[PDB]
């Protein structure tokens, strides 16, 4: 009993939030190449038998509603949950098209507390976003 | 009887705490490119942490930035696996 039970009828949802275009008022640049990522992830998780849902250019309000709604679905027949976030960010924060969302707010919808259908099941958050402004100069081998 | 409410979460970050993350406008982000390649090659063979460790190595060794701006040129990236999982995760069977 050292591995998660992954033989439920469904592997589970893979939610892909692909934020490429941001409201001009935010002053954030477009994230060229993120569509390549979103398509790569869609195909990859399709081959793993995840129910992939690709969402594009979501406001901060839409991200929170999406996470809330998804956490309230029936996950009883699903082995796991995956959420992929592709956006601008900083430490602890990912950006909707019009403003930031705390990562904690997103993940709290799925806490073993608030989403009983996923208690004991692996909840995977894959986050392509900045975590700050430091640069890694590397070192020679 | 109870488990922690924070148990069974895994956060696969593209980059280390405090750092920029790199995206290529033609190929996609370094992290997602590498993640998909390693899932493709190893999801039927390795446990997820070992898959994500191959992702770390791929990003760390095969990518380095090219920029006309010296400040952003020749930079590197390491992803950051944050595991509160309590079991091994295999995608097969």
């Amino acid at each position: 009993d050292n591995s998660y039970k992954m033989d439920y009828p469904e592997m589970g949802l893979c939610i892909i939030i692909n934020n490429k275009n941001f409201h001009k008022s935010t002053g954030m640049t477009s994230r060229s190449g993120t569509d390549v990522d979103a398509a790569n992830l869609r195909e990859t998780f399709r081959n793993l038998k995840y129910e992939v849902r690709n969402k594009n250019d979501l406001t901060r309000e839409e991200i929170v509603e999406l996470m809330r709604d998804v956490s309230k679905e029936d996950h009883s027949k699903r082995s796991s949950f995956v959420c992929v976030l592709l956006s601008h960010g900083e430490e602890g924060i990912i950006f909707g098209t019009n403003g930031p969302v705390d990562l904690k707010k997103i993940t709290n919808f799925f806490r073993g507390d608030r989403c009983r259908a996923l208690t004991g099941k692996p909840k995977l958050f894959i986050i392509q976003a900045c975590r700050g402004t430091e640069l890694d100069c590397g070192i020679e081998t | 009887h109870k488990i922690p409410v924070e148990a069974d979460f895994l956060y696969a970050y593209s980059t280390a705490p405090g750092y920029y993350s790199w995206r290529n406008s033609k190929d996609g982000s370094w992290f997602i490119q590498s993640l998909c390649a390693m899932l493709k090659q190893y999801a039927d063979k390795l446990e997820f942490m070992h898959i994500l460790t191959r992702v770390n190595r791929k990003v760390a060794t095969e990518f380095e930035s090219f920029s006309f701006d010296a400040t952003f040129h020749a930079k590197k990236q390491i992803p950051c696996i944050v595991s509160m999982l309590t079991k091994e995760l295999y995608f097969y069977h």
């Binding site: 060229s32 976003a129 | 920029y20 930035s65 952003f72």
Partner: peptide
């Protein structure tokens, strides 16, 4: 290559 761009930071993002």
């Amino acid at each position: 290559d761009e930071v993002d």
